[model samples]
Target: MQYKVILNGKTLKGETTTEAVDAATFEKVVKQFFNDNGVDGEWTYDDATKTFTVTE
Candidate 1:
């Protein structure tokens, strides 16, 4: 499934198709994305919609 991540009114697109969702998997994906993209920000998950919100 795809997730709609919005940060500072802009949308960050992400997709995941796993049989399960857990802390390890979530953290791995999130951290890697930020690191790879050279993004320095704080992020949190929105469980209701399964999206990540990054704030600077």
Candidate 2:
């Protein structure tokens, strides 16, 4: 699976072949995206759906 993440104010892509991602890594990625974008927001992770939602 491919994940589209924002890193250092640019879009950084990642891939995960596992069925689920490590919870800590997911959280870190989400936070990094937000910080990289220079925005204050929250993100939700749904392992079953394999999605991330950012709320500003």
Candidate 3:
């Protein structure tokens, strides 16, 4: 499945493709994304649409 990683209100890099991920894996990915961009804030994932939104 494909997933989106949004930082603040903008999409980062673009879509990420994966073979499917559990909650733990999803969290880890998000954590790494934040660290890579040096950002922290509220975020959520919509399993129905495979979208991740982060709000500053």
Candidate 4:
């Protein structure tokens, strides 16, 4: 499945897409994405829609 990263509830055109086999894999990528990219605020993950939302 595909994945997306939303910023403050709004969709970002860049930094989207994943073929992660499962939530575990996606979780790692998502967390690392924040760790390496350095985004502030709270980040939440949604399983149903496969999206990561970082609120500012």
Candidate 5:
């Protein structure tokens, strides 16, 4: 299975206090998403590819 959250991409990538907050929060949520799903690895985001990835 994969993850797909519908949010403004701009909010996730910008240069400002608000953007920093959202970006930081998003990473936390990504990690927690794994915890709740029982996955054992690391969560990450690919900037160039515009994708979220899990490393094992």
Candidate 6:
């Protein structure tokens, strides 16, 4: 599935694809995105919508 990562209020250009069959995998994918982007802050994920928000 494709997930959209929203930093601040803008959505990133490309979506992230993951084999996140469960919540744990989903969280890992989100964390990995943050790490790859060098983002450090609080984050929230909505399982139903497949969206993540990060704030630093």
TM-score of each: 0.32, 0.31, 0.32, 0.31, 0.33, 0.32
Taking the tens digit of each residue's C-alpha lDDT, what string does model 1 give over 1-56? 99764333222565543433455555677788778878665556546756679998
Off by over 4 Å in 6: 1-19, 41-56
- CA lDDT, every prediction? 0.59, 0.59, 0.60, 0.58, 0.62, 0.59
Model 4 lowest lDDT segment of ten: 5-14
Clashes of each: 0, 0, 0, 0, 0, 0
Between candidates 2 and 4, the one scoring higher on lDDT is: 2
How does model 4 score by TM-score?
Answer: 0.31
* Candidate 5, number of clashes: 0
- Could you tell me which residue pairs clash in candidate 3? none
lDDT of 5 by residue, 1-56 (tens): 98666544365555655443355576677678767988667555556655678898
Model 3 lDDT-worst window of ten: 5-14
Off by over 4 Å in 3: 1-19, 41-56
Candidate 6 residue lDDT tens string, 1-56: 98664333233565764434555654577778777979666556447655578998
Worst lDDT 10-window in candidate 5: 14-23
Error of 4 at 56 (Å): 45
lDDT of candidate 3 over 1-56, digit per residue (tens)? 99664333333566764444455555677777777988766557446755678998
Best prediction by lDDT: 5
Report the C-alpha lDDT of model 4 over 12-46, residue by residue, as the tens digit.
56567643455555456667787788854544744
